[PDB]
Design a binder for this molecule. Structure first.
Ligand SMILES: CCCCCCCCCCCCCCCCCC(=O)OC[C@H](COP(=O)([O-])OCC[N+](C)(C)C)OC(=O)CCCCCCCCCCCCCCCCC
Ligand SMILES: NC(=O)C1=CN([C@@H]2O[C@H](COP(=O)(O)OP(=O)(O)OC[C@H]3O[C@@H](n4cnc5c(N)ncnc54)[C@H](OP(=O)(O)O)[C@@H]3O)[C@@H](O)[C@H]2O)C=CC1
Ligand code: SF4
Lengths: 156, 109, 51, 115, 207, 325, 76
């Protein structure tokens, strides 16, 4: 039809790759990492959707902030987020990470990981169910599906 | 009762030894942590922090201050304290508020 | 026969063992964690390792 | 020629993969990203500092054993000889000498890593 | 007897009273008070000079092998002259019993580190110093433990604000996590849930 | 109580402007056309409900009206260093600024702040500068009280200035017109420019004036590039190259479909010497104390070094020589 | 070489910037004359240690109030 049509199909392929394979960084701070482990466990099995963990930030796409972020930990979280190569997304799971959670009015807690890194998805709960975190991952995949970077480039 | 120093003179000796240690360590700290400051700025900051407590007259309080300063010195010597933790001594994110009465009247109460 | 250059020399030890300066051991320092698979995610184990 | 061609083709395929990998993605560079990695905290010392080796003796033993393999490898052609008695005596003596060396190191605790 | 009331036994109370008198008369130079609660928990309040002697005795003595240092804590009571009350909770496995030892300290009156007696204190004393400001003499490695690296203050003190004075955020201009004075969208609500009527006549301080 | 619409937020200077506005606590509206992924860095620059991201298109004036609906201040940072297939210098520096200014006037915005360039002149050898002068005229025609800001070269972490020069290492040697001499540069700091814009958003005296934000010192291009290569401990091999050959090289580099490394207009602006203040207010009028390049060059240039020179002190490099023309 | 000692001492005292070069003299008390502080005199002693490659204890160093005292100490 048009170069615009070809570019749209190419960007659809791009987003298919990115969303089909997204490797969360092995990163968990508190309770909520246990529900992340359970979403890894057989009953839900993240790997079925192509979501496999990787320890190195250099080989990760999505950072799942799962648990309270303290003032002593925030710089390290930002450092690993920075060292993740782009494109990179952030899913803040749990109330501690969404805002402050139970420890919102504490002297040693960052009231929301979105004060340190720009968050892509927010999963409410304390902890959120493993199914709730899986729903968050699916929502992130939909977000990646609606990207159109190449169409923006071609229009530009 | 003495924590360490019997009197203000011994406390001052301890304080001056601490100042020597920090002055010596500033260059290595800047080089190792790759700070975007100069050795002059680091040593000026050390002096400013030391002088911020120059009003104290109690030997026990001076001993506590020296102990906590030694703790910070160890934390900096070792790279436990990172660049983000060290650049907080400079407050390069603060916009100073004025001390003028009229300025305060204009902004807030 | 002493010389200007040999002046700084000294006789060797009576037993060949020399009193040599203490050798600094600089054991490598590692920040095992917090973002480590085995550090449980919030532990900064500072390890001094020799190898 | 059939070997140079295939080796060069493999090298060119790998190089083309590298070129695509480096000149396709959109790149955003800054010091915080490009800094070295160490579990989220800044390294306290360079990685070029001496890194002690606790199996140095076993390494320098591996050198000699590798040369022993060098001496043992011509056996397929050696066994094709009419002096089979001499060839067998030599092979047995060489292998037994190697075994005695390994056993002596083992007993003297050379195979144990340094602490 | 009464279904909703805890059943109480006097054998433990009498044994604890006997052992309290025993320790008090074995260490008259340090013991300032001794008491057994209605929960049956022997509690020996000593002078701060007798911490090491008292713990060494309570660990080595045959009739008191309190060999496990379950807890080392500090309680902040601002009114009294000596703000901090240091509490050691000890367990004796040989006699299947527990004891508590209390002393006091002020912001400028350190205490002797008991790391020689119990090595378990190596971190409890560090926590006490970090959270209350009580200093300990002869500690191998006294430094902060729980608070941020450059943290200034002693949070567990009652005069410390709940949310502190500082908070962190990422500042793109400097490309770092910066510490700034605390501002909250909604301030902490301190509900006044104290009734005018006294609930327990048995704890009526005289007028 | 400020509501500010920043029309070029997703850029080198827009991020700093948005950051400082958020720090001031004023509501910010970011009209964007890029992908949603490109605005994540701005996402965290404001507390809850402070920042409002809305999509927009320069062609569609309804989007411009929607962006400038409830705004008291409209900052226009739109720009581009190369002529896109759809947008050229004329469009980027005249049509879009004029449309934004007229929409803002119709909506009723109290303040309009337009950013041009120090050497923006009607007779400039550079197409971009010549278009910028016309843009200034049209903006001041359709919004007579609009403030005009004329920064010099802006240097920062994400700049196309110090980074551009340090990137000449990939080409072994540095070609310069007249070997750098006969060319005076007065670079300003991006944080200073952003602070100036934000302060002008409220300074009572700033309405209707034109400012010139320039750094403290003026360097010859040769000495500036020498200082840059000294900071990025690289081998400085300068050599002269006539402007027509330089412009041909820029033409070659400007043929890429993506973001060109350099361009004819880019070399023209690199080599045109900055003017003198000449009675324009400057940063100190708005209360920004300009920061010298010597202090803030390390934070921009440390990432261009090799391992050997990565951990070198700011004082290990000889400062440039500043002219007084 | 006491003259060389005194020349190095003056060189370091002039390379120090708080003092006033013209007013700086071999007979100028750091505290009373030049106006230096305790910490300033500590930095002066550290600079002298740098120049002479020699350490100085605090007990000995607290008295080096003037350059002549410094050179007399270096005589050691
Ligand atoms: C067998 C399976 C393995 C196959 C491996 C090979 C994969 C082949 C995929 C073919 C699709 C090629 C398009 C890849 C684009 C990847 C980079 C990208 O998305 O950036 C878009 C870029 C970005 O465009 P942009 O510059 O407008 O985006 C904004 C730029 N910043 C961030 C600076 C604001 O667009 C391109 O120019 C890509 C053109 C590639 C031809
Ligand atoms: N050295 C410097 O940086 C100097 C800058 N200036 C001026 O400051 C202003 C900022 O430029 P700067 O941000 O520094 O560099 P940028 O190129 O990053 O500014 C580009 C901005 O303009 C937007 N933009 C470009 N084309 C269009 C378009 N066709 N429709 C809508 N938006 C568009 C971009 O949005 P996106 O990128 O998402 O398309 C981006 O926000 C410019 O006017 C520049 O001339 C003044 C003096 C020197
Ligand atoms: S959000 Fe709730 S469940 Fe998750 S880490 Fe925080 S307190 Fe635990």
């Amino acid at each position: 039809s048009r170069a615009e049509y070809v570019v749209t199909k190419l960007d659809d392929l791009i987003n298919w790759a990115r969303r089909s394979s997204l490797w969360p960084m092995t990163f968990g701070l508190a309770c909520c990492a246990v529900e992340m482990m359970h979403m890894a466990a057989p009953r839900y099995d993240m790997d079925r959707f192509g979501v496999v963990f990787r320890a190195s930030p250099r080989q990760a796409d999505v950072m799942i902030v799962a648990g309270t972020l303290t003032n002593k930990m925030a710089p390290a979280l930002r450092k690993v987020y920075d060292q993740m190569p782009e494109p990179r997304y952030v899913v803040s799971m749990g109330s501690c990470a969404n805002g402050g959670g139970y420890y919102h009015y504490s002297y040693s807690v960052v009231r929301g990981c979105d004060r340190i890194v720009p968050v892509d998805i927010y999963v409410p709960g304390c902890p959120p169910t493993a199914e709730a975190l899986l729903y968050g991952i699916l929502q992130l995949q939909r977000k990646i599906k609606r990207e159109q970077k190449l169409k923006i480039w071609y229009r530009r | 009762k003495p924590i360490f120093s019997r009197d203000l003179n011994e406390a001052k000796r301890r304080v001056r030894e601490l100042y020597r240690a920090w002055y010596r360590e500033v260059p290595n700290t800047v080089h190792l942590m790759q700070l975007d400051i100069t050795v002059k700025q680091g040593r000026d900051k050390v002096r400013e922090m030391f002088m911020k407590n120059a009003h104290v007259t109690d030997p026990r309080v001076v001993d506590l201050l020296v102990i906590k300063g030694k703790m910070e010195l160890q934390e900096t010597i070792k790279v436990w304290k990172q660049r983000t933790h060290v650049m907080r001594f400079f407050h390069e994110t603060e916009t100073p508020r004025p001390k003028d009465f009229l300025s305060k009247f204009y902004m807030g109460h | 026969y002493p010389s200007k250059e040999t002046a700084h020399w000294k006789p060797p030890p009576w037993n060949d063992v020399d009193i040599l300066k203490e050798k600094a051991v600089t054991n490598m320092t590692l920040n095992f964690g917090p973002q480590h698979p085995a550090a449980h995610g919030v532990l900064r184990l500072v390890l001094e390792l020799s190898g | 020629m059939n070997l140079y061609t295939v080796i060069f083709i493999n090298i060119l395929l790998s190089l083309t993969l590298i070129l695509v990998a480096f000149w396709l993605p959109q790149m955003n560079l800054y010091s915080e990203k490009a800094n070295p990695y160490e579990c989220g905290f800044d390294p306290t010392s360079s990685a070029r500092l001496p890194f002690s080796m606790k199996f140095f003796l076993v390494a320098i033993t591996f050198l000699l054993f590798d040369l022993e393999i060098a001496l043992l490898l011509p056996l397929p052609w050696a066994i094709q000889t009419i002096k089979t008695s001499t060839m067998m005596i030599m092979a047995f003596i060489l292998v037994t000498i190697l075994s005695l060396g390994l056993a002596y190191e083992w007993t003297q605790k050379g195979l144990e890593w340094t602490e | 007897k009464r279904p909703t009331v805890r059943p109480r036994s006097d054998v433990t109370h009498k044994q604890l009273s006997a052992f309290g008198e025993y320790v008090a008369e074995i260490l008259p130079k340090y013991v300032q008070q001794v008491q057994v609660s209605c929960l049956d928990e022997l509690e020996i309040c000593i002078h701060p000079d007798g911490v090491i002697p008292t713990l060494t005795f309570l660990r080595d003595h045959t009739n008191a092998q309190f060999k496990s240092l379950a807890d080392l804590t500090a309680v902040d009571v601002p009114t009294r002259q000596n703000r901090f009350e240091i509490v050691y909770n000890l367990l004796s496995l040989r006699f299947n019993s527990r004891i508590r030892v209390k002393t006091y300290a002020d912001e400028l009156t350190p205490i002797d580190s008991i790391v020689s007696v119990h090595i378990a204190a190596n971190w409890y004393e560090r926590e006490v110093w970090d959270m209350f400001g009580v200093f300990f003499f002869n500690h191998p490695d006294l430094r902060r433990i729980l608070t941020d690296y450059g943290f200034e203050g002693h949070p567990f003190r009652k005069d410390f604000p709940l949310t502190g004075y500082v908070e962190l955020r990422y500042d793109d201009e400097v490309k770092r996590v910066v510490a700034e004075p605390v501002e909250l969208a909604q301030e902490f609500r301190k509900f006044d849930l104290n009734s005018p009527w006294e609930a327990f006549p048995a704890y009526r301080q005289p007028p | 109580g400020v509501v500010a619409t920043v029309f070029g937020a997703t850029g080198f200077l827009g991020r700093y402007v948005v950051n400082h506005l958020g720090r001031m606590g004023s509501q910010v509206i970011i009209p964007y056309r890029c992908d949603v992924y490109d605005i994540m860095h701005l996402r965290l620059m404001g507390d809850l409900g402070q920042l409002t991201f809305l999509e927009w298109d320069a062609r569609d004036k309804d989007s411009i009206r929607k962006a400038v609906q409830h705004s008291n201040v409209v900052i226009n940072l739109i720009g581009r260093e190369w002529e896109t297939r759809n947008f050229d210098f004329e469009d980027v520096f005249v049509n879009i600024p004029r449309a934004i200014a007229q929409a803002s006037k119709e909506a009723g915005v109290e303040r309009f702040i337009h950013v041009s360039h120090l050497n923006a002149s009607m007779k400039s050898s550079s197409k971009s500068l010549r278009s910028k002068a016309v843009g200034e005229k049209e903006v001041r025609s359709v919004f007579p009280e609009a403030i005009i800001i004329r920064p010099s070269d802006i240097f920062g972490r994400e700049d196309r200035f110090l980074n551009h020069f340090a990137n000449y290492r990939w080409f072994l040697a540095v070609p310069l017109v007249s070997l750098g001499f006969k060319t005076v540069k007065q670079p300003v700091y991006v944080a200073d420019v952003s602070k100036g814009i934000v302060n002008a958003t409220k300074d009572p005296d700033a309405v209707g004036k034109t400012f010139a934000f320039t750094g403290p010192n003026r360097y010859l291009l040769f000495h500036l590039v020498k200082y840059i290569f000294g900071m990025t401990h690289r081998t400085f091999i300068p050599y002269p190259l006539p402007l027509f050959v330089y412009s041909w090289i820029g033409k070659l580099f400007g043929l890429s479909p993506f973001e060109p490394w350099t361009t004819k207009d880019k070399v023209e602006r690199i080599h045109i010497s900055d003017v003198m203040p000449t009675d324009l207010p400057g940063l100190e009028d708005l209360g920004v104390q300009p920061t010298p390049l010597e202090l803030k060059s390390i934070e921009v240039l440390r990432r261009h070094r090799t391992y050997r020179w990565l951990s070198s002190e700011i004082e290990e490099t000889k400062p440039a020589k500043t002219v007084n023309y | 070489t006491l003259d060389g000692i005194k020349d190095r001492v003056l060189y370091v005292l002039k390379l120090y910037d708080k003092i006033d070069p013209e007013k700086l003299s071999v007979n100028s008390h750091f505290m009373k004359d030049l106006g230096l502080d305790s910490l300033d005199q500590v930095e002066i002693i550290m600079a002298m240690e740098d120049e002479f490659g020699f350490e100085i204890p605090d007990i000995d160093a607290e008295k080096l109030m003037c350059p002549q005292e410094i050179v007399d100490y270096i005589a050691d």
